[PDB]
Amino acid sequence: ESADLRALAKHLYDSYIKSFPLTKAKARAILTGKTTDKSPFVIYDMNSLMMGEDKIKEQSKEVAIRIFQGCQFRSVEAVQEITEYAKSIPGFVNLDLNDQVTLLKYGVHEIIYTMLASLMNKDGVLISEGQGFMTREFLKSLRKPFGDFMEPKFEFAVKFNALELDDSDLAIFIAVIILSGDRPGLLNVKPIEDIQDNLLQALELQLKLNHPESSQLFAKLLQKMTDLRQIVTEHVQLLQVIKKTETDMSLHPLLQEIYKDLY
Amino acid sequence: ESADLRALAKHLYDSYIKSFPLTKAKARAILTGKDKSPFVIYDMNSLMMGEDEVAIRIFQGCQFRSVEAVQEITEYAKSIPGFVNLDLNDQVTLLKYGVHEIIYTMLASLMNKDGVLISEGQGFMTREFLKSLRKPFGDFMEPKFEFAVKFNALELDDSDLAIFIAVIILSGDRPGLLNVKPIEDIQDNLLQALELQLKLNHPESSQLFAKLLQKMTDLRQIVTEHVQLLQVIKKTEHPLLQEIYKD
Ligand SMILES: CCCc1cc2c(=O)n(C)oc2c(CCC)c1O[C@H](C(=O)[O-])c1ccc(C(C)C)cc1
């Protein structure tokens, strides 16, 4: 049985590399020391954003918004990536189509914030496929309320990154996130938990093998799932505010569908 | 050691029985069948008879009992190996944020699809009578019921709940903690005992351990949801009484 799980772990890590251009291993390399060819351009203020805009997508107003539409572009691209990955999870495409949609609807942002921690450190976040690095302080100072988006993600990334996970661990765990039978509105819950049950078993074996001297990483990792949940709810509120105060900004149909009647 | 955990598990169960009068085994006997039938509160008349506006007096009985549960829980928490040896401000902080979660976890023992055992198991208030309360209060306990039904589906017994409760208390991410290390260290022994307990007592349920930890999220969401409901009652709400229940 160990063998079957080991194979599933291998399978998932494989689809993970194929589905995501910027892995956590690559992100760490850039963030730390391969500083010569992989060194990012840093954006810490109003002006550097323009100086560096060569690789990116009332000054305050415009700026706070160029970043907004920028996160939106990347978001939709991330969704598309996560959707591609989901199809590789054994069993996922054989489920009721309606449920596939429902697992993605509530699963995608939870996955997005998890993997986004891979791109963050105490001081900031990699942007533009690793080529850029926007500082935490700059983001926290954008025109109000656009400055309240990122802090709670940074707060999580810092904690979650303390678990020292690598992509092979991440691949299984984000699959476990997706295959959650507790998502509101699912039709056939039993087929979904039968799969998740197998995924957790893979994650438990994987975690014991990769982090032997890390007592209850499996349990600690599972509890982090309450942190992501809280981050999307707080997030949704943030967006509802913006759609009223900024009636000129458009949401992308893909993100709009995800959010519509979510919780 | 695989036997140090079985000791700890055993220890908590004994303490848990000592600390909470109405166990799950005992509430399950009363909710399904086993003679001295509890008094049913299914409508306005059965209520005032059971005693032997209304929307309000009912919500405040839950508060009264919550205040009781909080004392039963802290008394229990102090028997958890290592808890008492933690910085006093932290013990207060853990209990402060953990009681609501532990309160729902246990209320689900006194619950089923159609009602909740009230008053030490003497009563039983129908889900319907509660769902049908005034404009604010009719949606009060309904969220707890949906949780209960889902959580009860795991079929945990008191011996499991006792360790699971301990784990909740020793949550190392409570806001304002001063020394997290020891808290998480304790939770690890607790998580180790909970895993071994579930594998031995529930061999067929493959990842019950994991299913149970995922419920801690459903739980936090129900508490954040309850708190925001206490907001709405306040902004639409006896001095010493107010003090006993300040929260
Ligand atoms: C972690 C970034 C969160 C995020 C940050 C910002 C921000 O600073 N501005 C100015 O607008 C934002 C939006 C709204 C986009 C419509 C965000 O939420 C997006 C969403 O709600 O989808 C989003 C966009 C990109 C990403 C990538 C980093 C994966 C994640 C979330």
Sign of the alpha-carbon dihedral angle for B92, B69, B212, A175: negative
Put simply, the answer to whether B192 touches A200 (Cβ < 8 Å) is: no
Q: Environment class of residue A222 by beta-carbon count within 10 Å: exposed (0-12), middle (13-18) or buried (19+)?
A: buried
Put simply, the answer to whether A182 touches B220 (Cβ < 8 Å) is: no
C-alpha B246: how far from chain center: 19
Name the 3-class secondary structure at A260: coil
Q: What is the spatial order of strands in the sheet that A41-43 belongs to?
A: A41-43, A132-135, A124-127, A120-121
Residue B184 identity (one-letter amino acid): E
Say which residue the tokens 């949780």 belong to.
B147
Q: Which residues are paired to B116 by β-bridges? A: B111, B125
Q: Which of B223, B222, B229 is nearest to B147 (CA)?
A: B222
Task: Find the helix or strand (DSSP H, E) in which B146 lies.
Answer: helix B142-152
Other beta carbons less than 10 A from residue A100's beta carbon: 18
Spatial distance between the Cα atoms of B38 and B44, rounded to a whole number of angstroms: 17
Q: Which of A126, A130, A122, A131 is nearest to A151 (CA)?
A: A122
- Angle at which helices B158-169 and B88-107 cross, to 10°: 140
Q: Environment class of residue A153 by beta-carbon count within 10 Å: exposed (0-12), middle (13-18) or buried (19+)?
A: buried
Spatial distance between the Cα atoms of B192 and B3, rounded to a whole number of angstroms: 11
- The reply to whether A225 touches chain B by the CB within 8 Å rule is yes
Say which residue the tokens 């739980």 belong to.
B219
Other beta carbons less than 10 A from residue A202's beta carbon: 23
Kindly state the tokens that stand for A62.
């415009």
Task: Find the helix or strand (DSSP H, E) in which A121 lies.
Answer: strand A120-121
Spatial distance between the Cα atoms of A123 and A42, rounded to a whole number of angstroms: 11
Q: Residue A220 region, left (φ>0) first, then alpha (ψ -120 to 50), else beta? A: alpha
Q: Environment class of residue B32 by beta-carbon count within 10 Å: exposed (0-12), middle (13-18) or buried (19+)?
A: exposed
Instruction: Determine how β-strand B123-126 pairs with β-strand B115-116.
Output: antiparallel
Kindly state the tokens that stand for A20.
């995501």
CB–CB of A223/A159 below 8 Å?
no
Under 8 Å CB-to-CB from B232, ≥6 apart: which residues? Answer: B136
Other beta carbons less than 10 A from residue A194's beta carbon: 13
CB-CB neighbors (< 8 A) of A219 in chain B: 191, 195, 209, 213
Kindly state the tokens that stand for A21.
């251009």
How many residues comprise chain A?
263
CA of A181 to the centre of ligand 1 (A): 26
Q: Give the largest Cα separation in chain A, rounded.
A: 63
Name the 3-class secondary structure at B85: coil
Instruction: Provide the strand spans (E) within chain A.
Output: 41-43, 120-121, 124-127, 132-135
CA of A17 to the centre of ligand 1 (A): 23
Q: How many helices (H) and strands (E) does chain A have?
A: 12, 4
Instruction: Determine how β-strand B111-112 pairs with β-strand B115-116.
Output: antiparallel
Residue in chain A lying closest to B174 (CA): A227
Instruction: Determine how β-strand A132-135 pairs with β-strand B39-41.
Output: unpaired
Domain B1-247 fold is Retinoid X Receptor (1.10.565)
Instruction: Determine how β-strand B39-41 pairs with β-strand B123-126.
Output: parallel
CA of A43 to the centre of ligand 1 (A): 17
Cis peptide before B203 (omega within 30 of 0): no
DSSP code string of B52-121? --HHHHHHHHHHHHHHHHHHHHHHHHTTSTTSTTS-HHHHHHHHHHHHHHHHHHHHTTSEETTEE--TTT
For chain B, percent helix, then strand, then coil, each to nearest 5? 65, 5, 30
Of B207, B213, B216, nearest to A197 by CB-CB distance is B207
Spatial distance between the Cα atoms of B130 and B116, rounded to a whole number of angstroms: 10
Q: What is the spatial order of strands in the sheet that B111-112 belongs to?
A: B39-41, B123-126, B115-116, B111-112
Way it was determined: X-ray
Residue in chain A lying closest to B219 (CA): A226
C-alpha B157: how far from chain center: 14
Spatial distance between the Cα atoms of B196 and B14, rounded to a whole number of angstroms: 17
CB-CB neighbors (< 8 A) of A204 in chain B: 207, 210
Q: Give the ligand 1 atom nearest the CA of A139.
A: 8
Spatial distance between the Cα atoms of A116 and A235, rounded to a whole number of angstroms: 15
Q: Which of A187, A106, A104, A219 is nearest to B214 (CA)?
A: A219
For ligand 1, atom 10, the nearest C-alpha belongs to A68
Name the 3-class secondary structure at A247: coil
CB–CB of A150/A141 below 8 Å?
no
CB–CB of B156/B150 below 8 Å?
no
DSSP 8-state class, residue B37: P
Other beta carbons less than 10 A from residue B48's beta carbon: 11
Q: How many helices (H) and strands (E) does chain B have?
A: 11, 4
For ligand 1, atom 29, the nearest C-alpha belongs to A75
Kindly state the tokens that stand for B4.
């140090």
- The reply to whether B63 touches chain A by the CB within 8 Å rule is no
For chain A, percent helix, then strand, then coil, each to nearest 5? 65, 5, 30
Name the 3-class secondary structure at B208: helix
Say which residue the tokens 């039963």 belong to.
B72
Kindly state the tokens that stand for A51.
């100086």
- Cα angle: B93, vertex B159, B83; to 5 degrees: 25
Terminal-to-terminal C-alpha distance of chain B: 40
Spatial distance between the Cα atoms of B246 and B239, rounded to a whole number of angstroms: 10
Spatial distance between the Cα atoms of B109 and B25, rounded to a whole number of angstroms: 8
Phi and psi torsions of B205, nearest 5°: -80, 95
Other beta carbons less than 10 A from residue A209's beta carbon: 14
Instruction: Provide the strand spans (E) within B133-234.
Output: none
Kindly state the tokens that stand for B85.
């040896």
CB–CB of A90/A196 below 8 Å?
no
Dihedral over alpha carbons A109, A180, B28, B164 (to 10 degrees): -70
Residue B124 identity (one-letter amino acid): F
DSSP 8-state class, residue A43: E
Kindly state the tokens that stand for A179.
């295959």
- The reply to whether A219 touches chain B by the CB within 8 Å rule is yes
Name the 3-class secondary structure at A134: strand
CATH number of A1-263: 1.10.565.10
Terminal-to-terminal C-alpha distance of chain A: 38
Spatial distance between the Cα atoms of A195 and A181, rounded to a whole number of angstroms: 10
